[PDB]
């Protein structure tokens, strides 16, 4: 449930005013989100975009302890958090807007499939050293939250959004599973799984854990070097766990070079234990990232 499994209050107020709904981006089960003007929330700006969550009993107690969680989680890697509106119905909590939409969504549009100006990025697809400055922001927001000793549960591109000037942050309005549900194997009754993101001690022990988070992260960078691809779309959702649970790898994307799939791979590692820390993930993706362009060439064959 993200947020909802690490509870189971300095939480700043917006007033209904100064929070002007303009038009919908998106609707889920659990409720809405919209593009609204928000008025005296930053200095030097006076009004500013913002996107607003929605509340569709317990529902607004659980609201409160996700808020009260939203205002500790703040860091350059996690999308922002101003705030709420308590004052009347629905109840609203307030988000940055970031422009480019979800990571998944923003690969695609950046991808040998895609349809066909370019302010953040250049004509056709992403380069070597834009797709490793994307993957390094992630690995960055997950070191912060294993830093926090959260655990995630559902780290995937669709999960992270894209803001003006390339800006990578984890972070979803908690839509995904009516967005992106093929992305998720269906149980029984409300019970959904992202299981071809999960490591084999997660589908096998229901275990989850700051290194299953590790191995997913391990799948997002799979998914920037595919450009949003599906892992394992080739299969079926009971094939896919026949492959993750008797130990098979996911196949080294065409733009991935040999040193980022050793990044990968360290991430599925079978025990868990032997997972290469996110710290240390960042810190090699970070590395190469920032690395000169006349060694990036030749990264790149
Ligand atoms: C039902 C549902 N499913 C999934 C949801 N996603 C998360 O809770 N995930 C998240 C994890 C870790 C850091 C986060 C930071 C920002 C935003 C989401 C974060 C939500 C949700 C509920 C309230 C605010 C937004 C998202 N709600």
């Known amino acids: 449930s993200?947020?909802?499994?690490?509870?189971?209050?300095?939480?700043?107020?917006?007033?209904?005013?100064?929070?002007?709904?303009?038009?919908?981006?998106?609707?889920?089960?659990f409720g809405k989100v919209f593009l609204a003007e928000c008025h005296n929330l930053l200095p030097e700006q006076?009004?500013?975009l913002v996107a607003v969550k929605a509340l569709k009993e317990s529902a607004r107690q659980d609201f409160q302890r996700e808020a009260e969680l939203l205002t500790m989680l703040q860091h350059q890697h996690i999308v922002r958090f101003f705030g709420v509106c308590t004052e009347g119905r629905p109840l609203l909590m307030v988000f940055e807007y970031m422009r480019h939409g979800d990571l998944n969504r923003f690969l695609r549009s950046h991808g040998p499939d895609a349809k066909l100006g370019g302010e953040d990025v250049?004509?056709?697809?992403?380069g070597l050293g834009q797709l490793l400055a994307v993957a390094?922001?992630?690995?960055?927001?997950?070191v912060y939250?294993?830093?926090?000793?959260?655990?995630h549960r559902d780290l995937a591109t669709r999960n992270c959004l894209v803001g003006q000037g390339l800006?990578?942050?984890?972070?979803?309005?908690?839509?995904?599973?009516?967005?992106y549900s093929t992305d998720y194997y269906r149980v029984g009754g409300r019970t959904m799984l992202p299981i071809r993101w999960m490591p084999?001690?997660?589908?096998?022990?229901?275990?989850?854990?700051?290194?299953?988070?590790?191995?997913?992260?391990?799948?997002?960078?799979?998914?920037?070097?595919?450009?949003?691809?599906?892992?394992?779309?080739?299969?079926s959702n009971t094939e896919a766990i026949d492959c993750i649970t008797q130990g098979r790898e996911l196949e080294r994307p065409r733009a991935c070079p040999p040193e980022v799939y050793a990044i990968m791979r360290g991430c599925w590692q079978r025990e868990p234990q032997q997972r290469h820390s996110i710290k240390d993930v960042h810190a090699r993706l970070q590395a190469l990232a920032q690395a000169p362009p006349v060694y990036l060439d030749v990264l790149g064959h």
């Not at 390094?136 to 997950?142: K, L, W």
Request: glycine content about 12%; hydrophobic content about 45%.
């Open 2 to 29: 993200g947020l909802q499994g690490h509870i189971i209050a300095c939480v700043h107020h917006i007033k209904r005013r100064d929070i002007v709904l303009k038009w919908e981006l998106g609707e889920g089960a």
């Open 167 to 179: 800006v990578v942050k984890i972070g979803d309005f908690g839509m995904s599973r009516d967005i």
């Open 145 to 151: 939250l294993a830093g926090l000793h959260f655990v």
């Open 200 to 235: 084999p001690e997660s589908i096998l022990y229901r275990k989850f854990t700051t290194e299953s988070d590790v191995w997913s992260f391990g799948v997002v960078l799979w998914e920037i070097f595919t450009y949003g691809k599906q892992p394992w779309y080739q299969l």
């Open 122 to 126: 250049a004509p056709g697809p992403l």
């Open 136 to 142: 390094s922001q992630v690995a960055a927001g997950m």
């Open 46 to 48: 006076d009004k500013m």
